[PDB]
Amino acid sequence: AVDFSAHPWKAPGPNDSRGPCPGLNTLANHGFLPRNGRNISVPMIVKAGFEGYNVQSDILILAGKVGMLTSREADTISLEDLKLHGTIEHDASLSREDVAIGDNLHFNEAIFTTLANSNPGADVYNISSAAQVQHDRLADSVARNPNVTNTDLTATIRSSESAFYLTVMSAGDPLRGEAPKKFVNVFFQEERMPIKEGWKRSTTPINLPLLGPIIDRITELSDWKPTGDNCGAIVLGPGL
Amino acid sequence: AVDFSAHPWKAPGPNDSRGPCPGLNTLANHGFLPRNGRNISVPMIVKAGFEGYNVQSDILILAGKVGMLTSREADTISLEDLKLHGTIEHDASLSREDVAIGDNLHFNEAIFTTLANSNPGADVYNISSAAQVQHDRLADSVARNPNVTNTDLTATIRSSESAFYLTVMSAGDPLRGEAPKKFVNVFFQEERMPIKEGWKRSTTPINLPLLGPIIDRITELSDWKPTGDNCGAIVLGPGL
Ligand code: HEM
Ligand code: HEM
Ligand SMILES: *[C@@H]1O[C@H](CO)[C@@H](O)[C@H](O)[C@H]1NC(C)=O
Ligand SMILES: *[C@@H]1O[C@H](CO)[C@@H](O)[C@H](O)[C@H]1NC(C)=O
Ligand SMILES: *[C@@H]1O[C@H](CO)[C@@H](O)[C@H](O)[C@H]1NC(C)=O
Ligand SMILES: *[C@@H]1O[C@H](CO)[C@@H](O)[C@H](O)[C@H]1NC(C)=O
Ligand SMILES: *[C@@H]1O[C@H](CO)[C@@H](O)[C@H](O)[C@H]1NC(C)=O
Ligand SMILES: [Mg+2]
Ligand SMILES: [Mg+2]
């Protein structure tokens, strides 16, 4: 029984490491991960994701070990390391700019406008709105970034990230693939768990069987096509 | 420093986990890594490679974290996990068969014949012989394997592996890029440190600055050329 009162939100300090991921940033901001954002292992991510969000080890082990590639350390990262373009970090993010034409690390309100204005007339974001947002963000990158990378891999990662905001920030049934806008907006804009606002950790485990169909449905509805070579190669370490 | 007398060679039993890598298998056979070949983390690899071979953390962290992708565990592998084709394990190996046409895991004497007969007339293997062997092994895979994969990435990994046998099994000066055949043959054929034969751990650290030029020279002298998509995508986990 995690006591969320024992995990208060605190804004990061000047020497706290933060990355392009609102999920991990939010866990650090509540002390489920180290508040300094440093020396974070995959076991630590597994535990934090379980405690904070009820996200299970299947997805966190897979994504965590890919994330470990971004650091120079044997078995840890700093959250900022995860900005390394072409490992996980990709163009056509929901709340960050493309690395070739801007800042791929920090929350950007102008970029976030697209998500914030989605699913007009409803009080939730859902699978169809998530797909529309992905379509529109990719169109923006294609229009403004001549170095855009858009592949089967990046498209799948992008749908995974949309599935995450729809499930982790849901009103309590992640299967629904819908989340209150008031929760998701706090998650992105403040990297805070919207506890005041009425959010509670899912009592349903969020695992790959739960996320998989949501991911695939978002992709299907997004009118997606690859760009260029469609090469699914990742960057294997920093510096290279 | 390191007590090699506390690290005797013992042949693996039928249940001991062993992989396609003679470097890690040899460390396990001397107990620098667990003799059962299981529950191995990147920190353990870093320590074992330092103690056994004077290989430094830079290369072992980079390679080790890519190797961790081959298991389902948060921060460990079994050595056999590393056989996963298309993460690190590749066609045109020095001592193993290609997975599409044979056994990509165990030492194979028929395959090893090419390396064993290289640098005729000399008592060492060196950079030019290593390059010739790589050329010949790739030609063999191209001739006989209808699913052969040959990319910039696999070529670089193959040259890295050649650089490893030339440096770790050297007669004490790894910069020379040459190793006694009597040492290298024991390393491959027995996965044993050739201590009775007169081998000693390098007193010179083996790191990426040392290996990089050897790797690049081997590639250069092998007359390597791209043969197709040349898409350097790795497999990011088992079962995918
Ligand atoms: C295994 C652990 C994790 C790793 C290594 C990781 C890594 C990343 C990285 C590198 C990005 C930036 C990609 C980009 O937009 O360019 C990202 C984005 C994202 N992550 Fe995570 N993540 C993890 C876990 C989670 C969790 C548990 C959530 C839960 C809500 C989450 C939600 C998101 C979202 C919504 C984005 C999109 C941000 C945007 O498009 O602006 N992640 N993640
Ligand atoms: C960082 C840790 C290591 C990992 C994860 C690793 C992984 C691997 C893998 C998966 C292979 C098989 C590739 C193939 O031939 O298809 C391989 C081959 C090889 N490794 Fe390692 N290795 C590591 C460290 C070392 C060390 C310290 C040496 C020292 C001599 C070494 C020497 C070799 C050699 C010579 C081969 C070629 C075998 C052949 O072509 O038949 N490795 N390694
Ligand atoms: C943690 O990460 C830093 C790099 O940010 C590294 O220098 C340090 O050795 C790591 N280890 C600790 C403090 O356990
Ligand atoms: C998303 O919500 C909108 C507005 O209520 C609705 O028209 C649409 O059908 C919903 N889509 C899904 C997948 O529920
Ligand atoms: C695996 O290694 C961990 C960490 O060192 C240890 O706690 C555990 O007992 C090991 N398990 C086995 C099966 O040896
Ligand atoms: C390798 O050894 C052979 C035989 O002694 C020699 O001809 C060749 O020049 C050597 N190559 C290098 C790079 O030393
Ligand atoms: C191997 O290549 C043949 C064509 O020569 C193809 O029919 C077969 O599907 C390939 N197998 C794999 C594992 O891709
Ligand atoms: Mg991005
Ligand atoms: Mg192989």
DSSP chain A: ---GGGS------TT----S-HHHHHHHHTTSS-TT--SB-HHHHHHHHHHHH-B-HHHHHHHHHHHHTTSSSSS-B-GGGGG-BTTTB-SS-SSS--TTTS-SSS--HHHHHHHHT-STTSSEEEHHHHHHHHHHHHHHHHHH-TT----HHHHHHHHHHHHHHHHHTSSS-GGG-EEEHHHHHHHHHH----TTTT----SS-B-HHHHHHHHHHHHHHTT----TT---PPP-SS--
**Domain extent at residue A217:** 14-221
Of A41, A229, A234, the CB nearest to B75: A41
Residue B226 counted as domain residue = no
Find the length of chain B: 240
A126: nearest Cα among A93, A155, A169: A169
Q: Are A82 and A67 in contact (CB under 8 A)?
A: yes
Q: How many angstroms separate the CA atoms of A43 and A49, rounded?
A: 10
Instruction: Give the dihedral of Cα atoms A37, A40, A43, A46; nearest 10 deg.
Output: 30
Phi, psi of A89 (to 5 degrees): -55, 135
Q: How far is CA A117 from CA A111, A129, A130, A207, in A?
A: 11, 10, 11, 28
For the CA atoms of chain A, what is the radius of gyration? 17
CATH of the domain at A83: 1.10.489.10
Residue B238 counted as domain residue = no
Residue B8 counted as domain residue = no
Q: Is residue A52 in contact with ligand 1, taking CB distance under 6 Å? A: no
The amino acid that residue B145 corresponds to is N
Residue B2 counted as domain residue = no
Token pair of B14, please?
């039928």
Residue B106 counted as domain residue = yes
Residue B1 counted as domain residue = no
Find the length of chain A: 240
Phi, psi of A188 (to 5 degrees): -75, -50
CB contact under 8 A, A236 and B66: yes
Q: What residues contact B71, with CB distance under 8 A and at least 6 apart? A: B77, B78, B81, B238
How many residue pairs from chains A and B have C-beta atoms closer than 8 A? Answer: 62
With a Cβ cut-off of 6 Å, ligand 2 is lined by: B 20-24, 45, 49, 53, 55, 60, 63-64, 67, 82, 88-90, 93-96, 161, 164-165, 168
Q: How far is B54 from chain A (nearest CA, A)?
A: 17
Q: How many angstroms separate the CA atoms of A12 and A10, rounded?
A: 6
Q: Which residue has the tokens 């045109």?
A: B92
* Distance from residue A23's CA to the centre of ligand 2 (Å): 35
With a Cβ cut-off of 6 Å, ligand 6 is lined by: B 119, 121-122, 126-129
**Signed CA dihedral, B82, B83, B86, B90: sign only:** positive
Phi, psi of B187 (to 5 degrees): -50, -55
Q: How many angstroms separate the CA atoms of A13 and A17, rounded?
A: 9
Residue A236 counted as domain residue = no
Find the residue in B nearest to A236 (Cα): B66
The domain tally of chain B equals: 1
For residue A167, count other CB atoms closer than 10 A to its CB: 24
Q: Are B23 and B168 in contact (CB under 8 A)?
A: yes
Q: How far is A49 from chain B (nearest CA, A)?
A: 13
Token pair of B82, please?
């590393």
* Resolution rounded to one decimal, in angstroms: 1.6
Q: How far is CA B21 from CA A84, A206, B37, B94, in A?
A: 29, 37, 12, 10
For residue B23, count other CB atoms closer than 10 A to its CB: 22
Residue A64 counted as domain residue = yes
User: Phi/psi zone of residue A128: left (φ > 0), alpha (ψ -120 to 50 degrees), beta?
Assistant: alpha
Q: What residues contact B177, with CB distance under 8 A and at least 6 apart? A: B126, B127, B163, B166, B167, B214, B217
SS (H, E, C) chain B: CCCHHHCCCCCCCCCCCCCCCHHHHHHHHCCCCCCCCCCECHHHHHHHHHHHHCECHHHHHHHHHHHHCCCCCCCCECHHHHHCECCCECCCCCCCCCCCCCCCCCCCHHHHHHHHCCCCCCCEEEHHHHHHHHHHHHHHHHHHCCCCCCCHHHHHHHHHHHHHHHHHCCCCCHHHCEEEHHHHHHHHHHCCCCCCCCCCCCCCCECHHHHHHHHHHHHHHCCCCCCCCCCCCCCCCCCC
Q: What angle do CA A23, A28, A29 make, to 5 degrees?
A: 95
Q: Strand B124-126 vs strand B178-180: parallel, antiparallel, or unpaired?
A: antiparallel
* Distance from residue B227's CA to the centre of ligand 8 (Å): 32
Q: What residues contact A230, with CB distance under 8 A and at least 6 apart? A: A151, A152
Q: What residues contact A64, with CB distance under 8 A and at least 6 apart? A: A42, A45, A46, B74
